[PDB]
């Protein structure tokens with residue numbers, strides 16, 4: 298077993314925790330570089346992860362190296378100074394300005410268009426893993442693997458937001474997710490930036506599914522062909538009627554609501570793609586504003 302390959306890094310503070318890893322702000326004792334370090338205590342993962350080292354995009358957090366040591370895997374990443382979750386909480390009383398919301402949505406759709414073109418899915422987009430900098434950029438981080446691994450961290454306080462961004466086909470037991478799962482997650486994040494409240498804040502898998510049903514209507518073969526034969530579908534689901542989007546995301550203009558409605562189509566095969574969404578009229582006036590960041 299290897300040793301010593303981490304002596305060059307000085308942990309500065311903890312910045313995140315997940316089911317299978319802990320994330321630190323760290324200073325390379327030699328380089329002087331400040332990085333983010335994910336520590337996973339302990340195959341197909343090595344090839345899948347090392348493939349993420351080549352997916353380089355201005356809207357994807359750069360993965361710098363992958364360091365295997367003493368039955369611990371380290372991921373070394375570029376460091377950003379704030380995540381969208383904290384920025385959204387910092388703006389809860391003022392709201393994020395719409396031109397900045399639009400900029401952020403456009404950039405993340407650019408990021409997803411890139412990954413999806415390379416047949417990479419994120420699988421777990423959440424405000425907490427969208428990272429922002431002072432110059433107005435936002436970046437995707439913490440790509441979810443197809444086969445999770447690593448010893449679960451016993452100190453992991455779970456989070457209320459865990460299921461809030463999960464696409465309905467995942468919740469209904471689809472075995473093979475498509476890139477449409479990421480568009481759903483981003484639509485949920487788009488709505489939350491606009492309204493300052495989570496769109497579908499479910500606290501169990503069935504609560505998550507039912508919160509979606511009460512808002513968009515219980516799906517049937519009319520809007521989602523094949524849904525009634527999905528693994529976890531139950532003919533005994535309650536039958537809620539669809540609400541109108543004017544009530545779900547005020548104060549979003551008609552272009553925004555139109556784009557959002559397409560990001561939240563039940564049928565993954567009808568849900569808009571990242572590339573098509575970039576062409577939506579909502580973005581004809583997109584700009585790149587500066588956020589006001591504290592630290």
Ligand SMILES: CCC(=O)N1CCN(CC)c2cc(C(=O)OC)ccc21
Nearest residue numbers: 313320333335372373374376377439
């Ligand atoms: C290499 C570490 C990594 O894989 N990830 C995904 C895990 N997290 C979330 C805590 C993360 C945060 C930051 C960051 O700059 O936070 C301010 C940078 C990278 C990562």
